[PDB]
Amino acid sequence: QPEPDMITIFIGTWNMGNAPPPKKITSWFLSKGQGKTRDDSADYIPHDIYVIGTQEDPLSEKEWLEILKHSLQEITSVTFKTVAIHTLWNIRIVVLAKPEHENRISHICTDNVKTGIANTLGNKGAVGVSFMFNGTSLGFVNSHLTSGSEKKLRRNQNYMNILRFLALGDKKLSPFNITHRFTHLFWFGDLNYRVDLPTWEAETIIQKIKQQQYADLLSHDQLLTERREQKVFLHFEEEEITFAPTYRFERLTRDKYAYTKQKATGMKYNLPSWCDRVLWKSYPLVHVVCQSYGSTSDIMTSDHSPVFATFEAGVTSQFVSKNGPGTVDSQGQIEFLRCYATLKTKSQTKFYLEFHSSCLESFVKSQEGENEEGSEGELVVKFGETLPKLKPIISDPEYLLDQHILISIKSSDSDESYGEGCIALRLEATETQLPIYTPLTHHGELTGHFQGEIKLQTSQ
Ligand SMILES: O=C(Nc1ccon1)c1cccc(Cl)c1
């Protein structure tokens, strides 16, 4: 029974509006409705993993698990196993997997982050799950960010707090936040970004939606504009949106957007918006393809419509050789030539690197680099040919070319990371000097770059 080199992953996000769901929600898990939808010919083919994020969820865990499992069994005739479930207030994540995957899944972590302070602490935040699927690390975040059209900067702050403080994945990756811990990270939820057009334009917006003309609305979507300005979700992907705004609907129909201010809304307008989103970030040169991104049309208990996204994701085996794991395989090596970091910092500490990878027995600390002044007022840290030769546990190119090296640049004075990035070993050639590059981030914001050359020796 061979180990897979690809799986499919379903991501769902639904703000349930504190109401129980209707009796049938299968259209969600089938990726049917509006947008990029799934072909009918796939309806009986189960996804490998289903990840369900809810917000304003009124159900108990037991109640929602029974609905989800009975839904999937009706679609697929498969009884899914529960990998994890975690709830913060009314924000919930459920991970279900095909029973054949049960002994491929390990290292299951859950965590939550509560956002805000005083007034604004008590209902917004995020839940997450991570695990290993054979050789591949997977992370999932469901966040309910701050509401309201004039609070985009709050939402961006909520995002930074969640990625800083959510504790998922391998704790030995101490310099790295969740945006670097996983082969594939999926971040979804009621992100609550709005279409920023004047209140007076509400009926104009509604008209546009009825004509399926979304371009002049998407050009004002706050998530797209904040991402384009590098204010949030740096280095994440999102599929093109081709479905109508998923908020705010009159309940029990989808014929009406309920946008006008009411006491129940704090006298705020809710112009039609794409509140409900799925984004992802995968390591460089790993296969990930979005195969659906859309909203259901027939689930109408909430003022939001459910959103679905599905992905093909590359996965790798749990590799064993005669040598590693448990020793190095001295037919493998990783060399860095002519490497330098460019940092936005004003500081003048010396810096050193750490190299982290599950292809190493443990992380590797470099010597301090040589600081120079860049022409345009930057710090350039030169490592030259001074960097330690990395000794992978396995030399087989079928394993080693699929790996990645995480890099942190740390202050000698504080041991704090000033920037994190990732280099793929999926090279065009072995035993050949080749350019490498990663941006560097800290707390998910750009802090610099790392570039140089690599030389990879495998057993072939
Ligand atoms: O123990 C598991 N899941 C849960 C969640 C709540 O209680 N048990 C588990 C462990 C490994 C693989 C799988 Cl498919 C499931």
Side-chain angles (χ1 to χ4, degrees), residues 23-27 29-30 43-44 50 66-80:
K23 59 176 178 283
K24 181 173 205 54
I25 62 169
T26 55
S27 63
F29 308 118
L30 290 173
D43 287 357
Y44 304 145
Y50 291 79
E66 186 189 315
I67 288 160
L68 294 173
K69 289 200 175 199
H70 283 152
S71 294
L72 295 184
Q73 182 140 92
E74 180 161 281
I75 288 162
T76 67
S77 302
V78 172
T79 300
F80 275 74

mmCIF file with all atom_site columns, all heavy atoms in Angstrom, residues 23-27 29-30 43-44 50 66-80:
data_model
loop_
_atom_site.group_PDB
_atom_site.id
_atom_site.type_symbol
_atom_site.label_atom_id
_atom_site.label_alt_id
_atom_site.label_comp_id
_atom_site.label_asym_id
_atom_site.label_entity_id
_atom_site.label_seq_id
_atom_site.pdbx_PDB_ins_code
_atom_site.Cartn_x
_atom_site.Cartn_y
_atom_site.Cartn_z
_atom_site.occupancy
_atom_site.B_iso_or_equiv
_atom_site.pdbx_formal_charge
_atom_site.auth_seq_id
_atom_site.auth_comp_id
_atom_site.auth_asym_id
_atom_site.auth_atom_id
_atom_site.pdbx_PDB_model_num
ATOM 1   N N   . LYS A 1 23 ? -30.619 21.350 8.103  1.00 0.00 ? 23 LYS A N   1
ATOM 2   C CA  . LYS A 1 23 ? -30.458 19.881 8.169  1.00 0.00 ? 23 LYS A CA  1
ATOM 3   C C   . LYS A 1 23 ? -29.429 19.362 7.157  1.00 0.00 ? 23 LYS A C   1
ATOM 4   O O   . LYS A 1 23 ? -28.777 18.374 7.428  1.00 0.00 ? 23 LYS A O   1
ATOM 5   C CB  . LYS A 1 23 ? -31.806 19.177 7.948  1.00 0.00 ? 23 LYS A CB  1
ATOM 6   C CG  . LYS A 1 23 ? -32.543 19.421 6.648  1.00 0.00 ? 23 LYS A CG  1
ATOM 7   C CD  . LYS A 1 23 ? -33.815 18.552 6.579  1.00 0.00 ? 23 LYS A CD  1
ATOM 8   C CE  . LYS A 1 23 ? -34.657 18.743 5.330  1.00 0.00 ? 23 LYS A CE  1
ATOM 9   N NZ  . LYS A 1 23 ? -35.472 19.988 5.375  1.00 0.00 ? 23 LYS A NZ  1
ATOM 10  N N   . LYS A 1 24 ? -29.294 20.011 6.019  1.00 0.00 ? 24 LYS A N   1
ATOM 11  C CA  . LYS A 1 24 ? -28.358 19.555 4.989  1.00 0.00 ? 24 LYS A CA  1
ATOM 12  C C   . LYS A 1 24 ? -27.328 20.655 4.715  1.00 0.00 ? 24 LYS A C   1
ATOM 13  O O   . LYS A 1 24 ? -27.686 21.765 4.345  1.00 0.00 ? 24 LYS A O   1
ATOM 14  C CB  . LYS A 1 24 ? -29.111 19.183 3.718  1.00 0.00 ? 24 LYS A CB  1
ATOM 15  C CG  . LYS A 1 24 ? -28.247 18.674 2.590  1.00 0.00 ? 24 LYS A CG  1
ATOM 16  C CD  . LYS A 1 24 ? -29.136 18.192 1.457  1.00 0.00 ? 24 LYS A CD  1
ATOM 17  C CE  . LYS A 1 24 ? -28.469 17.156 0.583  1.00 0.00 ? 24 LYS A CE  1
ATOM 18  N NZ  . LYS A 1 24 ? -27.957 16.010 1.378  1.00 0.00 ? 24 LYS A NZ  1
ATOM 19  N N   . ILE A 1 25 ? -26.059 20.280 4.856  1.00 0.00 ? 25 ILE A N   1
ATOM 20  C CA  . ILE A 1 25 ? -24.930 21.221 4.578  1.00 0.00 ? 25 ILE A CA  1
ATOM 21  C C   . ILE A 1 25 ? -23.940 20.562 3.630  1.00 0.00 ? 25 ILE A C   1
ATOM 22  O O   . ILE A 1 25 ? -22.820 21.068 3.469  1.00 0.00 ? 25 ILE A O   1
ATOM 23  C CB  . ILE A 1 25 ? -24.293 21.700 5.896  1.00 0.00 ? 25 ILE A CB  1
ATOM 24  C CG1 . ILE A 1 25 ? -23.700 20.539 6.701  1.00 0.00 ? 25 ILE A CG1 1
ATOM 25  C CG2 . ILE A 1 25 ? -25.222 22.597 6.671  1.00 0.00 ? 25 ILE A CG2 1
ATOM 26  C CD1 . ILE A 1 25 ? -22.846 21.024 7.859  1.00 0.00 ? 25 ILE A CD1 1
ATOM 27  N N   . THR A 1 26 ? -24.353 19.492 2.948  1.00 0.00 ? 26 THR A N   1
ATOM 28  C CA  . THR A 1 26 ? -23.436 18.779 2.049  1.00 0.00 ? 26 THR A CA  1
ATOM 29  C C   . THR A 1 26 ? -22.842 19.654 0.922  1.00 0.00 ? 26 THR A C   1
ATOM 30  O O   . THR A 1 26 ? -21.741 19.377 0.490  1.00 0.00 ? 26 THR A O   1
ATOM 31  C CB  . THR A 1 26 ? -24.049 17.506 1.472  1.00 0.00 ? 26 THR A CB  1
ATOM 32  O OG1 . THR A 1 26 ? -25.244 17.934 0.868  1.00 0.00 ? 26 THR A OG1 1
ATOM 33  C CG2 . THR A 1 26 ? -24.363 16.482 2.528  1.00 0.00 ? 26 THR A CG2 1
ATOM 34  N N   . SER A 1 27 ? -23.573 20.680 0.453  1.00 0.00 ? 27 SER A N   1
ATOM 35  C CA  . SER A 1 27 ? -23.100 21.556 -0.648 1.00 0.00 ? 27 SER A CA  1
ATOM 36  C C   . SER A 1 27 ? -21.784 22.232 -0.251 1.00 0.00 ? 27 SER A C   1
ATOM 37  O O   . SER A 1 27 ? -21.012 22.533 -1.107 1.00 0.00 ? 27 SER A O   1
ATOM 38  C CB  . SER A 1 27 ? -24.122 22.592 -1.019 1.00 0.00 ? 27 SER A CB  1
ATOM 39  O OG  . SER A 1 27 ? -24.355 23.460 0.081  1.00 0.00 ? 27 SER A OG  1
ATOM 40  N N   . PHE A 1 29 ? -19.260 20.892 1.631  1.00 0.00 ? 29 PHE A N   1
ATOM 41  C CA  . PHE A 1 29 ? -18.165 19.910 1.531  1.00 0.00 ? 29 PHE A CA  1
ATOM 42  C C   . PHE A 1 29 ? -17.976 19.436 0.091  1.00 0.00 ? 29 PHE A C   1
ATOM 43  O O   . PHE A 1 29 ? -16.902 18.937 -0.196 1.00 0.00 ? 29 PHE A O   1
ATOM 44  C CB  . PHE A 1 29 ? -18.381 18.739 2.499  1.00 0.00 ? 29 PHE A CB  1
ATOM 45  C CG  . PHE A 1 29 ? -18.640 19.207 3.908  1.00 0.00 ? 29 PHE A CG  1
ATOM 46  C CD1 . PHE A 1 29 ? -19.849 18.903 4.524  1.00 0.00 ? 29 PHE A CD1 1
ATOM 47  C CD2 . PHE A 1 29 ? -17.785 20.107 4.531  1.00 0.00 ? 29 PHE A CD2 1
ATOM 48  C CE1 . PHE A 1 29 ? -20.139 19.376 5.788  1.00 0.00 ? 29 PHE A CE1 1
ATOM 49  C CE2 . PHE A 1 29 ? -18.111 20.577 5.792  1.00 0.00 ? 29 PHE A CE2 1
ATOM 50  C CZ  . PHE A 1 29 ? -19.286 20.245 6.381  1.00 0.00 ? 29 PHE A CZ  1
ATOM 51  N N   . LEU A 1 30 ? -18.972 19.629 -0.758 1.00 0.00 ? 30 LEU A N   1
ATOM 52  C CA  . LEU A 1 30 ? -18.880 19.335 -2.203 1.00 0.00 ? 30 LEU A CA  1
ATOM 53  C C   . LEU A 1 30 ? -18.358 20.528 -2.994 1.00 0.00 ? 30 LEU A C   1
ATOM 54  O O   . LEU A 1 30 ? -18.239 20.380 -4.219 1.00 0.00 ? 30 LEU A O   1
ATOM 55  C CB  . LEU A 1 30 ? -20.254 18.906 -2.705 1.00 0.00 ? 30 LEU A CB  1
ATOM 56  C CG  . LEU A 1 30 ? -20.708 17.540 -2.198 1.00 0.00 ? 30 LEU A CG  1
ATOM 57  C CD1 . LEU A 1 30 ? -22.148 17.303 -2.612 1.00 0.00 ? 30 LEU A CD1 1
ATOM 58  C CD2 . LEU A 1 30 ? -19.772 16.454 -2.737 1.00 0.00 ? 30 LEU A CD2 1
ATOM 59  N N   . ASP A 1 43 ? -17.839 14.140 -6.897 1.00 0.00 ? 43 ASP A N   1
ATOM 60  C CA  . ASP A 1 43 ? -18.623 14.234 -5.647 1.00 0.00 ? 43 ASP A CA  1
ATOM 61  C C   . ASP A 1 43 ? -18.410 13.071 -4.676 1.00 0.00 ? 43 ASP A C   1
ATOM 62  O O   . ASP A 1 43 ? -18.534 13.295 -3.451 1.00 0.00 ? 43 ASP A O   1
ATOM 63  C CB  . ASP A 1 43 ? -20.116 14.306 -5.900 1.00 0.00 ? 43 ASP A CB  1
ATOM 64  C CG  . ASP A 1 43 ? -20.607 15.633 -6.469 1.00 0.00 ? 43 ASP A CG  1
ATOM 65  O OD1 . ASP A 1 43 ? -19.771 16.572 -6.640 1.00 0.00 ? 43 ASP A OD1 1
ATOM 66  O OD2 . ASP A 1 43 ? -21.797 15.704 -6.842 1.00 0.00 ? 43 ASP A OD2 1
ATOM 67  N N   . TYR A 1 44 ? -18.159 11.860 -5.146 1.00 0.00 ? 44 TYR A N   1
ATOM 68  C CA  . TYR A 1 44 ? -18.001 10.709 -4.229 1.00 0.00 ? 44 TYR A CA  1
ATOM 69  C C   . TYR A 1 44 ? -16.568 10.531 -3.783 1.00 0.00 ? 44 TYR A C   1
ATOM 70  O O   . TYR A 1 44 ? -16.301 9.612  -2.951 1.00 0.00 ? 44 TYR A O   1
ATOM 71  C CB  . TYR A 1 44 ? -18.457 9.419  -4.908 1.00 0.00 ? 44 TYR A CB  1
ATOM 72  C CG  . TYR A 1 44 ? -19.853 9.439  -5.429 1.00 0.00 ? 44 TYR A CG  1
ATOM 73  C CD1 . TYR A 1 44 ? -20.136 8.745  -6.594 1.00 0.00 ? 44 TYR A CD1 1
ATOM 74  C CD2 . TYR A 1 44 ? -20.866 10.141 -4.815 1.00 0.00 ? 44 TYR A CD2 1
ATOM 75  C CE1 . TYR A 1 44 ? -21.418 8.717  -7.113 1.00 0.00 ? 44 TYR A CE1 1
ATOM 76  C CE2 . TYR A 1 44 ? -22.151 10.161 -5.331 1.00 0.00 ? 44 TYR A CE2 1
ATOM 77  C CZ  . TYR A 1 44 ? -22.419 9.435  -6.481 1.00 0.00 ? 44 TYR A CZ  1
ATOM 78  O OH  . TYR A 1 44 ? -23.713 9.427  -6.963 1.00 0.00 ? 44 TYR A OH  1
ATOM 79  N N   . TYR A 1 50 ? -10.255 17.165 5.959  1.00 0.00 ? 50 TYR A N   1
ATOM 80  C CA  . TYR A 1 50 ? -11.264 18.237 6.019  1.00 0.00 ? 50 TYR A CA  1
ATOM 81  C C   . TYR A 1 50 ? -10.981 19.084 7.238  1.00 0.00 ? 50 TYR A C   1
ATOM 82  O O   . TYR A 1 50 ? -10.867 18.573 8.347  1.00 0.00 ? 50 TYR A O   1
ATOM 83  C CB  . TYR A 1 50 ? -12.689 17.687 6.115  1.00 0.00 ? 50 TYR A CB  1
ATOM 84  C CG  . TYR A 1 50 ? -13.163 17.001 4.850  1.00 0.00 ? 50 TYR A CG  1
ATOM 85  C CD1 . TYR A 1 50 ? -12.766 15.703 4.553  1.00 0.00 ? 50 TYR A CD1 1
ATOM 86  C CD2 . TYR A 1 50 ? -14.039 17.624 3.971  1.00 0.00 ? 50 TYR A CD2 1
ATOM 87  C CE1 . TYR A 1 50 ? -13.229 15.050 3.420  1.00 0.00 ? 50 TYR A CE1 1
ATOM 88  C CE2 . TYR A 1 50 ? -14.527 16.968 2.859  1.00 0.00 ? 50 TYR A CE2 1
ATOM 89  C CZ  . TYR A 1 50 ? -14.042 15.706 2.546  1.00 0.00 ? 50 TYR A CZ  1
ATOM 90  O OH  . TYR A 1 50 ? -14.483 15.043 1.411  1.00 0.00 ? 50 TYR A OH  1
ATOM 91  N N   . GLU A 1 66 ? -21.064 15.521 15.307 1.00 0.00 ? 66 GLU A N   1
ATOM 92  C CA  . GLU A 1 66 ? -22.053 14.541 14.798 1.00 0.00 ? 66 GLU A CA  1
ATOM 93  C C   . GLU A 1 66 ? -22.599 15.033 13.453 1.00 0.00 ? 66 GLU A C   1
ATOM 94  O O   . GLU A 1 66 ? -22.826 14.226 12.528 1.00 0.00 ? 66 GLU A O   1
ATOM 95  C CB  . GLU A 1 66 ? -23.121 14.310 15.859 1.00 0.00 ? 66 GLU A CB  1
ATOM 96  C CG  . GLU A 1 66 ? -24.091 13.230 15.480 1.00 0.00 ? 66 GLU A CG  1
ATOM 97  C CD  . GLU A 1 66 ? -25.252 13.188 16.448 1.00 0.00 ? 66 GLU A CD  1
ATOM 98  O OE1 . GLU A 1 66 ? -24.991 13.264 17.664 1.00 0.00 ? 66 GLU A OE1 1
ATOM 99  O OE2 . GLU A 1 66 ? -26.399 13.145 15.976 1.00 0.00 ? 66 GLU A OE2 1
ATOM 100 N N   . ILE A 1 67 ? -22.822 16.331 13.319 1.00 0.00 ? 67 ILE A N   1
ATOM 101 C CA  . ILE A 1 67 ? -23.295 16.880 12.041 1.00 0.00 ? 67 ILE A CA  1
ATOM 102 C C   . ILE A 1 67 ? -22.231 16.716 10.983 1.00 0.00 ? 67 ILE A C   1
ATOM 103 O O   . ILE A 1 67 ? -22.535 16.253 9.869  1.00 0.00 ? 67 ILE A O   1
ATOM 104 C CB  . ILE A 1 67 ? -23.743 18.325 12.231 1.00 0.00 ? 67 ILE A CB  1
ATOM 105 C CG1 . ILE A 1 67 ? -25.054 18.397 13.006 1.00 0.00 ? 67 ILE A CG1 1
ATOM 106 C CG2 . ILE A 1 67 ? -23.837 19.008 10.885 1.00 0.00 ? 67 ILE A CG2 1
ATOM 107 C CD1 . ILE A 1 67 ? -25.322 19.719 13.631 1.00 0.00 ? 67 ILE A CD1 1
ATOM 108 N N   . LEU A 1 68 ? -20.985 17.064 11.278 1.00 0.00 ? 68 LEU A N   1
ATOM 109 C CA  . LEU A 1 68 ? -19.925 17.004 10.257 1.00 0.00 ? 68 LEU A CA  1
ATOM 110 C C   . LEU A 1 68 ? -19.703 15.556 9.835  1.00 0.00 ? 68 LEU A C   1
ATOM 111 O O   . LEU A 1 68 ? -19.614 15.276 8.642  1.00 0.00 ? 68 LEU A O   1
ATOM 112 C CB  . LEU A 1 68 ? -18.633 17.600 10.805 1.00 0.00 ? 68 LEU A CB  1
ATOM 113 C CG  . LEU A 1 68 ? -18.652 19.090 11.100 1.00 0.00 ? 68 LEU A CG  1
ATOM 114 C CD1 . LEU A 1 68 ? -17.387 19.478 11.779 1.00 0.00 ? 68 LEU A CD1 1
ATOM 115 C CD2 . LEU A 1 68 ? -18.889 19.898 9.837  1.00 0.00 ? 68 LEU A CD2 1
ATOM 116 N N   . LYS A 1 69 ? -19.516 14.649 10.780 1.00 0.00 ? 69 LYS A N   1
ATOM 117 C CA  . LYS A 1 69 ? -19.231 13.252 10.403 1.00 0.00 ? 69 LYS A CA  1
ATOM 118 C C   . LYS A 1 69 ? -20.377 12.631 9.588  1.00 0.00 ? 69 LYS A C   1
ATOM 119 O O   . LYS A 1 69 ? -20.126 11.952 8.603  1.00 0.00 ? 69 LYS A O   1
ATOM 120 C CB  . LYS A 1 69 ? -18.899 12.419 11.623 1.00 0.00 ? 69 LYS A CB  1
ATOM 121 C CG  . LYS A 1 69 ? -17.580 12.731 12.245 1.00 0.00 ? 69 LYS A CG  1
ATOM 122 C CD  . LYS A 1 69 ? -17.153 11.580 13.095 1.00 0.00 ? 69 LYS A CD  1
ATOM 123 C CE  . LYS A 1 69 ? -15.795 11.908 13.569 1.00 0.00 ? 69 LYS A CE  1
ATOM 124 N NZ  . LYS A 1 69 ? -15.044 10.758 14.039 1.00 0.00 ? 69 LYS A NZ  1
ATOM 125 N N   . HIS A 1 70 ? -21.618 12.854 9.992  1.00 0.00 ? 70 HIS A N   1
ATOM 126 C CA  . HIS A 1 70 ? -22.794 12.305 9.270  1.00 0.00 ? 70 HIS A CA  1
ATOM 127 C C   . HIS A 1 70 ? -22.881 12.944 7.882  1.00 0.00 ? 70 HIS A C   1
ATOM 128 O O   . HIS A 1 70 ? -23.243 12.253 6.921  1.00 0.00 ? 70 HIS A O   1
ATOM 129 C CB  . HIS A 1 70 ? -24.071 12.487 10.105 1.00 0.00 ? 70 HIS A CB  1
ATOM 130 C CG  . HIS A 1 70 ? -24.222 11.524 11.234 1.00 0.00 ? 70 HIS A CG  1
ATOM 131 N ND1 . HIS A 1 70 ? -24.929 11.844 12.383 1.00 0.00 ? 70 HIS A ND1 1
ATOM 132 C CD2 . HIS A 1 70 ? -23.792 10.253 11.397 1.00 0.00 ? 70 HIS A CD2 1
ATOM 133 C CE1 . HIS A 1 70 ? -24.921 10.813 13.204 1.00 0.00 ? 70 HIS A CE1 1
ATOM 134 N NE2 . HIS A 1 70 ? -24.222 9.831  12.629 1.00 0.00 ? 70 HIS A NE2 1
ATOM 135 N N   . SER A 1 71 ? -22.534 14.223 7.746  1.00 0.00 ? 71 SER A N   1
ATOM 136 C CA  . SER A 1 71 ? -22.482 14.890 6.418  1.00 0.00 ? 71 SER A CA  1
ATOM 137 C C   . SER A 1 71 ? -21.504 14.139 5.509  1.00 0.00 ? 71 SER A C   1
ATOM 138 O O   . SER A 1 71 ? -21.886 13.673 4.428  1.00 0.00 ? 71 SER A O   1
ATOM 139 C CB  . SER A 1 71 ? -22.084 16.334 6.544  1.00 0.00 ? 71 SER A CB  1
ATOM 140 O OG  . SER A 1 71 ? -23.082 17.073 7.223  1.00 0.00 ? 71 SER A OG  1
ATOM 141 N N   . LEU A 1 72 ? -20.260 14.030 5.943  1.00 0.00 ? 72 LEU A N   1
ATOM 142 C CA  . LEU A 1 72 ? -19.198 13.410 5.134  1.00 0.00 ? 72 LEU A CA  1
ATOM 143 C C   . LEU A 1 72 ? -19.581 11.961 4.835  1.00 0.00 ? 72 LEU A C   1
ATOM 144 O O   . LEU A 1 72 ? -19.260 11.495 3.744  1.00 0.00 ? 72 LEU A O   1
ATOM 145 C CB  . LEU A 1 72 ? -17.842 13.557 5.812  1.00 0.00 ? 72 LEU A CB  1
ATOM 146 C CG  . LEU A 1 72 ? -17.341 14.999 5.954  1.00 0.00 ? 72 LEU A CG  1
ATOM 147 C CD1 . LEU A 1 72 ? -15.942 14.962 6.564  1.00 0.00 ? 72 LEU A CD1 1
ATOM 148 C CD2 . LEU A 1 72 ? -17.341 15.743 4.625  1.00 0.00 ? 72 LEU A CD2 1
ATOM 149 N N   . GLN A 1 73 ? -20.087 11.231 5.813  1.00 0.00 ? 73 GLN A N   1
ATOM 150 C CA  . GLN A 1 73 ? -20.428 9.805  5.562  1.00 0.00 ? 73 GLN A CA  1
ATOM 151 C C   . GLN A 1 73 ? -21.504 9.755  4.485  1.00 0.00 ? 73 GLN A C   1
ATOM 152 O O   . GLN A 1 73 ? -21.441 8.874  3.608  1.00 0.00 ? 73 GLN A O   1
ATOM 153 C CB  . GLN A 1 73 ? -20.972 9.161  6.831  1.00 0.00 ? 73 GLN A CB  1
ATOM 154 C CG  . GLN A 1 73 ? -21.302 7.681  6.632  1.00 0.00 ? 73 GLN A CG  1
ATOM 155 C CD  . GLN A 1 73 ? -20.886 6.946  7.861  1.00 0.00 ? 73 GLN A CD  1
ATOM 156 O OE1 . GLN A 1 73 ? -21.674 6.757  8.785  1.00 0.00 ? 73 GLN A OE1 1
ATOM 157 N NE2 . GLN A 1 73 ? -19.607 6.615  7.895  1.00 0.00 ? 73 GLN A NE2 1
ATOM 158 N N   . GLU A 1 74 ? -22.458 10.663 4.496  1.00 0.00 ? 74 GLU A N   1
ATOM 159 C CA  . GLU A 1 74 ? -23.527 10.670 3.477  1.00 0.00 ? 74 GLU A CA  1
ATOM 160 C C   . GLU A 1 74 ? -22.901 10.915 2.095  1.00 0.00 ? 74 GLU A C   1
ATOM 161 O O   . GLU A 1 74 ? -23.278 10.214 1.114  1.00 0.00 ? 74 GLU A O   1
ATOM 162 C CB  . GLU A 1 74 ? -24.558 11.750 3.769  1.00 0.00 ? 74 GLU A CB  1
ATOM 163 C CG  . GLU A 1 74 ? -25.686 11.806 2.740  1.00 0.00 ? 74 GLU A CG  1
ATOM 164 C CD  . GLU A 1 74 ? -26.946 12.523 3.219  1.00 0.00 ? 74 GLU A CD  1
ATOM 165 O OE1 . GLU A 1 74 ? -27.745 11.892 3.974  1.00 0.00 ? 74 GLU A OE1 1
ATOM 166 O OE2 . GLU A 1 74 ? -27.138 13.698 2.837  1.00 0.00 ? 74 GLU A OE2 1
ATOM 167 N N   . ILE A 1 75 ? -21.940 11.827 1.993  1.00 0.00 ? 75 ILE A N   1
ATOM 168 C CA  . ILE A 1 75 ? -21.307 12.184 0.692  1.00 0.00 ? 75 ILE A CA  1
ATOM 169 C C   . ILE A 1 75 ? -20.467 11.017 0.192  1.00 0.00 ? 75 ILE A C   1
ATOM 170 O O   . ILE A 1 75 ? -20.500 10.707 -1.010 1.00 0.00 ? 75 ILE A O   1
ATOM 171 C CB  . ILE A 1 75 ? -20.443 13.445 0.840  1.00 0.00 ? 75 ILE A CB  1
ATOM 172 C CG1 . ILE A 1 75 ? -21.319 14.680 1.018  1.00 0.00 ? 75 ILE A CG1 1
ATOM 173 C CG2 . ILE A 1 75 ? -19.526 13.586 -0.360 1.00 0.00 ? 75 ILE A CG2 1
ATOM 174 C CD1 . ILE A 1 75 ? -20.538 15.880 1.611  1.00 0.00 ? 75 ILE A CD1 1
ATOM 175 N N   . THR A 1 76 ? -19.637 10.480 1.050  1.00 0.00 ? 76 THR A N   1
ATOM 176 C CA  . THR A 1 76 ? -18.474 9.651  0.655  1.00 0.00 ? 76 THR A CA  1
ATOM 177 C C   . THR A 1 76 ? -18.615 8.182  1.039  1.00 0.00 ? 76 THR A C   1
ATOM 178 O O   . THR A 1 76 ? -17.826 7.371  0.543  1.00 0.00 ? 76 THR A O   1
ATOM 179 C CB  . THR A 1 76 ? -17.193 10.145 1.338  1.00 0.00 ? 76 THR A CB  1
ATOM 180 O OG1 . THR A 1 76 ? -17.217 9.941  2.747  1.00 0.00 ? 76 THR A OG1 1
ATOM 181 C CG2 . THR A 1 76 ? -16.936 11.600 0.993  1.00 0.00 ? 76 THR A CG2 1
ATOM 182 N N   . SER A 1 77 ? -19.540 7.859  1.945  1.00 0.00 ? 77 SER A N   1
ATOM 183 C CA  . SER A 1 77 ? -19.717 6.499  2.536  1.00 0.00 ? 77 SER A CA  1
ATOM 184 C C   . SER A 1 77 ? -18.488 6.139  3.358  1.00 0.00 ? 77 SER A C   1
ATOM 185 O O   . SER A 1 77 ? -18.231 4.923  3.582  1.00 0.00 ? 77 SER A O   1
ATOM 186 C CB  . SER A 1 77 ? -20.015 5.456  1.455  1.00 0.00 ? 77 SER A CB  1
ATOM 187 O OG  . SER A 1 77 ? -21.181 5.833  0.749  1.00 0.00 ? 77 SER A OG  1
ATOM 188 N N   . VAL A 1 78 ? -17.690 7.135  3.756  1.00 0.00 ? 78 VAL A N   1
ATOM 189 C CA  . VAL A 1 78 ? -16.510 6.937  4.643  1.00 0.00 ? 78 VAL A CA  1
ATOM 190 C C   . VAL A 1 78 ? -16.816 7.540  6.000  1.00 0.00 ? 78 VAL A C   1
ATOM 191 O O   . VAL A 1 78 ? -17.380 8.631  6.074  1.00 0.00 ? 78 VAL A O   1
ATOM 192 C CB  . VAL A 1 78 ? -15.247 7.541  4.008  1.00 0.00 ? 78 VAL A CB  1
ATOM 193 C CG1 . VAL A 1 78 ? -14.065 7.530  4.949  1.00 0.00 ? 78 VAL A CG1 1
ATOM 194 C CG2 . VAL A 1 78 ? -14.904 6.823  2.712  1.00 0.00 ? 78 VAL A CG2 1
ATOM 195 N N   . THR A 1 79 ? -16.443 6.841  7.061  1.00 0.00 ? 79 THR A N   1
ATOM 196 C CA  . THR A 1 79 ? -16.508 7.329  8.439  1.00 0.00 ? 79 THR A CA  1
ATOM 197 C C   . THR A 1 79 ? -15.164 7.967  8.785  1.00 0.00 ? 79 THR A C   1
ATOM 198 O O   . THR A 1 79 ? -14.137 7.298  8.915  1.00 0.00 ? 79 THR A O   1
ATOM 199 C CB  . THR A 1 79 ? -16.830 6.235  9.464  1.00 0.00 ? 79 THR A CB  1
ATOM 200 O OG1 . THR A 1 79 ? -18.101 5.705  9.087  1.00 0.00 ? 79 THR A OG1 1
ATOM 201 C CG2 . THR A 1 79 ? -16.930 6.764  10.879 1.00 0.00 ? 79 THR A CG2 1
ATOM 202 N N   . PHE A 1 80 ? -15.154 9.289  8.876  1.00 0.00 ? 80 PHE A N   1
ATOM 203 C CA  . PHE A 1 80 ? -13.887 10.021 9.053  1.00 0.00 ? 80 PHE A CA  1
ATOM 204 C C   . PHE A 1 80 ? -13.466 9.923  10.511 1.00 0.00 ? 80 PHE A C   1
ATOM 205 O O   . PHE A 1 80 ? -14.305 9.916  11.391 1.00 0.00 ? 80 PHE A O   1
ATOM 206 C CB  . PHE A 1 80 ? -14.046 11.487 8.611  1.00 0.00 ? 80 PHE A CB  1
ATOM 207 C CG  . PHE A 1 80 ? -13.842 11.645 7.124  1.00 0.00 ? 80 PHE A CG  1
ATOM 208 C CD1 . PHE A 1 80 ? -14.794 11.229 6.226  1.00 0.00 ? 80 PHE A CD1 1
ATOM 209 C CD2 . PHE A 1 80 ? -12.652 12.127 6.640  1.00 0.00 ? 80 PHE A CD2 1
ATOM 210 C CE1 . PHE A 1 80 ? -14.542 11.312 4.858  1.00 0.00 ? 80 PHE A CE1 1
ATOM 211 C CE2 . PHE A 1 80 ? -12.398 12.210 5.280  1.00 0.00 ? 80 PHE A CE2 1
ATOM 212 C CZ  . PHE A 1 80 ? -13.333 11.737 4.402  1.00 0.00 ? 80 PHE A CZ  1
#
